[PDB]
Structure 1
């Protein structure tokens, strides 16, 4: 886990900023190769949050989840991760409107593979949104940002708790219950965002109006140009009943098969 500050070189320019601190690009000297890294650098509770985040990432190993290199206590506490050069998915798609539907399916399918793994691992992400999907290439997505994530108890399939309300399942709001199934609800919002080239969901609406809309069985409409199959999958993820909502094994299989259909169409 613990890295040597002398082997880490940080760039002056920042990639992002917020209340927690900053994200910077850097280099870490590995056993032989040098490795480009993204480094979350902290501004009592905050240290514990970062260390909890590191504890979760330590336990994960999947091609579609961002890898932690380790942590370092220097000028500030730092979390050192592999770099995804193209950055957050929503910003990428906003800037690259030529990205084709097939390519979007490919990316969201990769996210569903990472989330099928996270579900198998019994961790709940709790912040699954397009902003937290990072692109290694235009054809390779990874899930990031495990700051709100929780390891489920051996005897329960949910964690009982601001909140990113527009990505939250109704039971998260009504009962404070977070499960892989609530992450599936968030994944439906993520799909919507991706097929909307990074537009924010529920435009112009307050969180409380989104909760009212949802309780009435109402849902965002189909993004321009979005395949009906993918919109149907968003609706499936937005199943109000937790038991009937698909888990990620079912979601991933639907996407996998549709992606194969589109790959076939392309060959034709």
Structure 2
């Protein structure tokens, strides 16, 4: 959990940047072989979110969730994770048109299995999007970025407190469930089959909220398998209670994939 800083080496250069700061390729020395890692460096509000983020990742063990090596307190605080070489799913699918829909069907199904696991563990992601999926190989996808994630209380199915990936009940009533993540996964799927395209192009959050309360949804992407588009619309059920959970979505994706 707490790593030695002399057994970790970084690059000078980063991979990307947000508000938290930089993400960097690095090399952690293990019992005897080195392992290639992605390290989230921090440029005490922000410090506390990181230790929370690592806390979520600590309790999660699934092949489709990014794996955490540990935390390193040195210089700046550092979250050290298993490296997923190909990186984000959107910038990739942007830069790789040739990727056949069967590949994308496989890739988003791995996510749904990942999210199914998360639902069963009663954790809410609250940030599920193409950008926050990473690729180990072209046929191995993992869910990343648990910075906004929450462990649900044993006695409730929602946390009470990015608008384009958010379920309507998240906007109006501030409630975040696995069902609201199912909505996000809907948008994630749209992005995937649109090859990394931004959802609701050139619309402000309130225009998106307007459209949805009219019972309108995003149009089917160019060349998207038809059954997969029906799934996006079911994922985007306005009513929380008739919207499917992740087991239900994972089932369809599996069934249609071997078809």
Fold-level match, TM-score > 0.5?
A: yes
Shift of residue 211, structure 1, vs aligned partner: 0.2
Match of 1:14, SS state, is coil
Match of 1:36, SS state, is strand
Shift of residue 219, structure 1, vs aligned partner: 0.2
Distance in 1, matches of 2:164 and 2:44, equals: 29
> Where in structure 1 do 4 or more consecutive aligned residues deviate above 4 Å?
none
Number of residues of Structure 1 aligned to a counterpart in Structure 2: 259
Match of 2:13, SS state, is strand
Distance in 1, matches of 2:15 and 2:45, equals: 24
Shift of residue 19, structure 1, vs aligned partner: 2.0
Shift of residue 18, structure 1, vs aligned partner: 2.3
Shift of residue 125, structure 1, vs aligned partner: 0.1
1:69-98 C-alpha deviation (Å, 9 max, x unpaired) = 000010100000000100100000000000
1:157-191 C-alpha deviation (Å, 9 max, x unpaired) = 00001xx0000000000100000000000000000
Distance in 1, matches of 2:55 and 2:29, equals: 22
1:120-152 C-alpha deviation (Å, 9 max, x unpaired) = 000000000000000000000000000000000
Distance in 1, matches of 2:135 and 2:175, equals: 30
Shift of residue 206, structure 1, vs aligned partner: 0.6
Distance in 2, matches of 1:20 and 1:133, equals: 18
2:71 matched to 1:91? no
Shift of residue 31, structure 1, vs aligned partner: 1.1
Distance in 2, matches of 1:52 and 1:10, equals: 23
1:238-259 C-alpha deviation (Å, 9 max, x unpaired) = 0000000000000000000111
Match of 1:12, SS state, is coil
TM-score normalised by structure 2 residue count:
0.99
Shift of residue 21, structure 1, vs aligned partner: 1.2
Match of 1:245, SS state, is coil
Match of 2:15, SS state, is strand
Distance in 2, matches of 1:85 and 1:118, equals: 23
Structure 1 stretch 71-80 or stretch 13-22: which is displaced more? 13-22
Match of 2:209, SS state, is helix
TM-score normalised by structure 1 residue count:
0.96
Distance in 2, matches of 1:19 and 1:64, equals: 25
Match of 2:208, SS state, is helix
Instruction: Show structure 1 runs of 5+ residues with no match.
Output: 262-268
Distance in 2, matches of 1:166 and 1:62, equals: 27
Match of 1:66, SS state, is coil
